[model samples]
Target: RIYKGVIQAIQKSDEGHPFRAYLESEVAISEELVQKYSNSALGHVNCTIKELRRLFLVDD
Candidate 1:
């Protein structure tokens, strides 16, 4: 929930900001990995999702 807004806010805030310079690729990779693991049915994958979602402020 909040993460999506956070993403949009950051992009809307600036195009080439320094936070983007340092965190942009890392956050992009995290989003990519989340999508990748979301499709899997492994048990630990659920826990991993929980951890990420907790930090990212996603709803379950």
Candidate 2:
């Protein structure tokens, strides 16, 4: 339910920017350890989710 809610919120936002479908569709095989890189904006996410990563890996 929480997952669906977030997807809807992002998809229904008024930013006038389109949300990428890959946000709802893609799944990674493993992971990339995110470090502070100035090459691009790290996006809206705030922190690393250890348990969430485990959950996605198992669920995927």
Candidate 3:
């Protein structure tokens, strides 16, 4: 079984964590793509990380 303690420990980070910063930048890029193209399809593979996120994980 996966150890929740170990996973929780790794998730510890401040708001300024590098991973957080990088994710923000990526999100910003996707936003720019949407604004410039005015279409999710035009924004490259359905626009931003959001599309990828939905495809890989969640649903409607």
Candidate 4:
């Protein structure tokens, strides 16, 4: 369920982008949860989030 692109965006953000940092931290926490509940039948949350971002957040 780890969306590599979102994780990469967070990791690539500089100190100037506080929002990215906050988002990255949140996603990191979610990743931890995914790891903890590895046995659960969870769908692709990351991909869903990514699509959401693309639809609502992305401008170009």
Candidate 5:
């Protein structure tokens, strides 16, 4: 998936190696969750990317 590709690419890169290692490890766990869960992770969420956007997307 999209998430996998991006992280894989970053893991092969020299940029921010520690953070990339953290993400790489966490990504493996996330992939396992995908196989174990029957529904989308956000299926029961009461929020949207818009809310996520609101938390982060802002102009100064």
Candidate 6:
């Protein structure tokens, strides 16, 4: 639900920005990896994605 919501939000306001798809793809891929390696340490990966999304959405 959260992932879908994030994707929906991004798609709604992406405005055809080139980087938006890249950011969204990164998030989707990371999300899959998170599920695949459920026990692995994902803190760093999550932090990176969070920062990327924040920068793309809020700082751009």
State the C-alpha lDDT per candidate.
0.57, 0.36, 0.47, 0.50, 0.45, 0.52
State how far residue 56 of model 4 sits from its true place (Å): 19
Cα lDDT tens digits, model 6, 11-34, are 664876867877778766755543
Better of 5 and 6 by TM-score: 6
lDDT of 1 by residue, 1-60 (tens): 475787676775466676665676676566665564556435556446646744542323
lDDT of 5 by residue, 1-60 (tens): 476767567657546566676666775654544433333234522123323323322110
Report model 4's TM-score to 2 decimal places: 0.38
Q: After best superposition, candidate 5 residue 4: deviation in angstroms? A: 11
Model 1 TM-score on a 0 to 1 scale: 0.41
Give the per-residue lDDT of model 4 (tens digit) for 1-60: 566866566557754476787776776666544443333324555344444443332221
Each candidate: RMSD to true structure? 5.0, 12.2, 8.4, 9.1, 8.5, 8.2
lDDT of 6 at 60: 12
lDDT pick, better of 1 and 6: 1
What lDDT score goes with residue 16 in model 4? 46
In lDDT terms, which candidate is top?
1
- Candidate with top TM-score is 1
- TM-score of every model? 0.41, 0.19, 0.33, 0.38, 0.34, 0.38
In terms of lDDT, the poorest run of 10 residues in model 3 is 51-60
Candidate with better lDDT, 1 vs 2: 1
The lDDT of model 1 is 0.57
Candidate that beats the other on TM-score, 2 or 5, i.e. the better one: 5
What pairs collide in candidate 6?
none
